């Protein structure tokens, strides 16, 4: 007669739970949109040095007189002739395809090419710091309050970063936006799990995956609709303001209230749900006495994770897997410029291919196996992206399709690694294991733009790293034991016994 | 320093052939960028042909494709460029660089095609 019993006592599949789960999971479309917005608003259009006004361009026979030509025939993107000298009167950007981006507005083309990736790295370190510190603050403070502050901060950061006058302001406010966004995602999934019964957690996860895929599609569509970058960021971040406006109607998880040592608020929330769900007598059956008689068992760290040596090795393996998966995924997703096709179509097809990958991954894990699924997905994705980097830019359809299959394999690998990290870890630190896996994944997502920044030395070195890291990850995680069997570790005593079992 | 003294200027009838070259120093012809530029009287710096490191290939311009021949020479650190069936609009001073935009460039050689 635990908290789950009381949850099914008042509905459990009722209108209140559904309305809250949709009202809470809706902004994840904007989550994905803001995640990929740095990719879609930092598009680099063709550019070249602007000749000085000392000599008129009419007698120059065009702009090609004072512009050296590169390998492909376009004018040089950083350097200019003296009648050499570098770009000293700014750059000229064509607005045929991309009206305005951050690089176009702030001349982040030559000798500033690193800042375009540095802004994304700042957003990712924001995501990591936000996840950590706001998970701590949500455990210490609450869930509904953290969520509403997350909505407010996301909206404020989005607006005041789209209206950034300088670049440092933009990077700092993207840092804050990543903070808020990681916090809202983690607290969204946590609250949805906490207020739903045990039977529907898998349905909640499937819904969140569908929502992310639909958000990718929505980003593609809106970005097709809005060509600018300030206007795109406004139209992507403003709905978070109405999200904050309506998020005061949320009902916080009663499980957290019970874990906080206060039961009157839990009782109040229970009959609040009862009134919303329409069943009044069932809520009236609840009382102060019945609360402790139902949650007596419920009412009554990294260190301990790293003390045990075999646990330390398992943690190192899973951390490497998470790091490599997120690193490759965010190194591949944010390179849509070099596919030779309009970003809208490739983003749409990415969103389309996200789901069949999930289907195939589910089939192989629940029918064939888990370790073969992880191996196939990770190794094949790494090989595909590596050979995509090797294949020259002359061909476009093959590279685009290759990467369309890559992204799907990365999504399947994400599902597989989440299932692993939630499965092999003992229940003592299973949540700690999930947190550490997500933290290492965000560390990888931090590092990946830094690696991609080093594209000035070689034109395929970032892609070579993106394609080589998953291979090393598979090589070092091949030693992970199979876990298709029913036995699921609970404490730390059977971890060595499970190794003894195999 | 780097010196790019060039020679080959003269008068040749249309349809003839004479080779152009600039004597480079301090670098070989198989390591870095190298181009050829024209400027007819009243015309601008028109790019003619390009050679990259290690003989990556051959490439010309719109009015230059299928009409011009460019050949390198690793022995004397020079580029030996020949032209046959001389266009009568190609009266220009020939320039050679050491990169695609560089601090060192040739002094100049002027040829006449006449008729």
Residue numbers in the entry:
A (entry chain A): 1 to 83, 102 to 318, 325 to 526
B (entry chain B): 1 to 115
Sentences from the paper on this structure:
To address this question, we determined the structure of Oat1 in the absence of a ligand. The apo structure, determined at 3.52 Å, contains density within site 1 close to Lys382 and Asn439 and occupying a similar position to the keto group of α-KG. Given the buffer composition of the apo state contained high phosphate, unlike the ligand structures that had no phosphate, we modeled this density as a phosphate molecule. As phosphate has no impact on OAT1 transport we interpret this structure as the apo state. Two further densities are observed, one interacting with the hydroxyl group of Tyr230 and the other sitting close to Phe438 and Phe442, which are likely to be additional phosphate molecules. We observed no obvious density in site 2. Comparing these two structures reveals no notable changes in the backbone positions (root mean squared deviation (r.m.s.d.) of 0.629 Å for 496 Cα atoms); however, two changes in the density around several conserved side chains were observed. Aspartate 378 (TM8) can now be modeled interacting with Lys431 (TM10), whereas in the α-KG structure, Asp378 is rotated away, facing the α-KG ligand. Therefore, the binding of α-KG appears to break the Asp378-Lys431 salt bridge interaction between two gating helices, TM8 and TM10. The second observable difference is that Tyr230 (TM5) adopts two rotamer positions, whereas, in the ligand-bound structures, only one is observed.
